[PDB]
Amino acid sequence: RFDDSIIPRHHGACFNVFIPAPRDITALIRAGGKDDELINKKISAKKIDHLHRQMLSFVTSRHNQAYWVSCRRETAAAGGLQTLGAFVEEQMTWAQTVVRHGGWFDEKDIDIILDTAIFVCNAFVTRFRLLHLSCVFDKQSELALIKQVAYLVAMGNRLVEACNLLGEVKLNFRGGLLLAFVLTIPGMQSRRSISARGQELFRTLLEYYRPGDVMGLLNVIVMEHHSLCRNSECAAATRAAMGSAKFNKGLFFYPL
Ligand SMILES: [Zn+2]
């Protein structure tokens, strides 16, 4: 007797056990210039919020902005979904912060982390399509949407079309809400071109986002499909999509 059910064997590997969560940014500048495990780039929502003035004078400083922006886009062009989910996390948590402090998405003046939201978003979704979406999503109604939101963003501009498409749909299933979080900073940055119902969706996703949510949703989605998907190629593609999580040269922090 035993019962192998009470073991979360579906949870996969575990390199860090769950640990319960309870003025200098040069270490964050130096994290940006190197690839590292995310646990080495990690930081707390409230640590960043304490460091807003200072990290703001860094990301909006003119010196090397051209390099950090190209460098981030270079990583995101070659990174897998672990890199890109890391970038999406960093920018979602950064935005949420600058807003709380009275900032806004004004394309005039450059913010390193923000000036790449749309590039990073395009890159993630383009990599999402490397999955066997058909195997993953299941419900035909959900897969139908997800596949289309991925079609528009991945091919061409068409960001407004994908933002608008999401505003119409109810996002009570994980795959769509994920992609919504991905587009939330492209969404806000495109606020005066999208449907009012989009404008409201992305606004709320932004204010209701907590720093784990994107790497979380991506994790549990991939995790639970592969508790049953015995398919050899679907698993092989899932592995290709998320490459090294240690390929993040442009990333300044991984938020929590
Ligand atoms: Zn599968």
Author numbering: 189 to 210, 221 to 454
What does the original paper state about this entry?
KSHV encoded multifunctional protein ORF57 plays a key role in promoting viral mRNA accumulation and translation. Previous biochemical studies showed that ORF57 is stabilized by dimerization, which is critical for its function. ORF57 comprises of two domains with distinct putative structures: the highly disordered N-terminal domain (NTD) from residue 1 to 166, and the helix-rich C-terminal domain (CTD) from residue 167 to 455. Each monomer contains a zinc ion chelated by four residues, the cysteines at the position 333, 427, 432, and the histidine at 423, which form a consensus zinc-binding motif.
The cubic crystal crystallized at very high concentrations of salt buffer contains 0.01 M MgCl2, 0.05 M HEPES (pH 7.0), 4.0 M LiCl. After data calculation, the cubic crystal consists only of monomers in the crystal asymmetric unit, while in the spindle shape crystal ORF57-CTD forms a dimer in the crystal asymmetric unit and the resolution was relatively lower. The monomeric crystal belongs to space group I432 and the final structure was refined at resolution of 3.06 Å with R and Rfree values to 22.5% and 26.9%, respectively. The observed monomer structure revealed that ORF57-CTD consists of 11 α-helixes and two short β-sheets. The structure of monomeric ORF57-CTD forms a globular domain which consisting of bundle of 11 α-helixes connected with unstructured loops of various sizes. The N-terminus is represented by an extended “arm” region lacking any α-helixes, but only two unstable small η-helixes (310-helixes). The electron densities for residues V168-R189 and P211-D220 and S455 are not visible in the monomeric structure.
